[PDB]
């Protein structure tokens, strides 16, 4: 009989759901890694500019 | 990242200045020595122009 088994047909639909949201808990983290990363690509280029600029000024001064 | 970029430029922008200082006084020296061996010539040129 299905009684205890009756409950495993739900626990399988409500396991489908919980995996679909651990396929969103991965997507969210992808976007957030690609965000955190890009905030440091902007950090890299802007500093590089300020170091190109600081030595160029100090040459014209010299 | 800021911290080691600011410390990157500083440790070059003292060295560069220090070295430019060595060159400034040698390039001052490089026009003086030419001049004092092309000296009797200026004096003579000027003289023949203040007796009028």
* Cβ–Cβ gap B9/A54 under 8 Å: yes
Method: cryo-EM
Nearest CA distance, B35 vs chain A (angstrom): 25
Residue A56, CA atoms < 13 Å, CB-side half-sphere: 6
Q: At what angle do helices B15-36 and A41-61 cross, to 10 degrees?
A: 20
Tell me if B9 and A55 make a contact (CB, 8 A cut-off). yes
Tokens coding A2: 């299905």
Chain B CB within 8 Å of residue A14 CB: no
Resolution in Å, one decimal place: 8.7
d(CA A52, CA A46): 10
Give whole-number Cα distances, B52 to A2, A57, B45, B46, B49, in Å.
133, 51, 13, 12, 7
Identify all chain A residues contacting B25, using CB atoms and an 8 Å cutoff.
none
Cα–Cα distance, A61 to A55 (Å, whole number): 10
């Amino acid at each position: 009989k299905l009684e205890a088994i009756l409950s495993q047909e739900v626990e399988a639909e409500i396991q489908a759901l919980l995996q679909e949201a651990e396929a969103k808990a991965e997507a969210v983290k992808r976007e957030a890694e690609e965000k955190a990363k890009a905030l440091l690509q902007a950090r890299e280029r802007a500093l590089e500019a300020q170091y190109r600029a600081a030595l160029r000024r100090a040459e014209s001064a010299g | 990242l800021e911290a080691q970029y600011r410390e990157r430029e500083r440790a070059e922008t003292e060295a560069l200045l220090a070295r430019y200082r060595e060159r400034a006084e040698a390039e001052a020296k490089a026009v003086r020595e030419k001049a004092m061996a092309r000296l009797d010539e200026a004096v003579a040129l000027v003289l023949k122009e203040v007796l009028p």
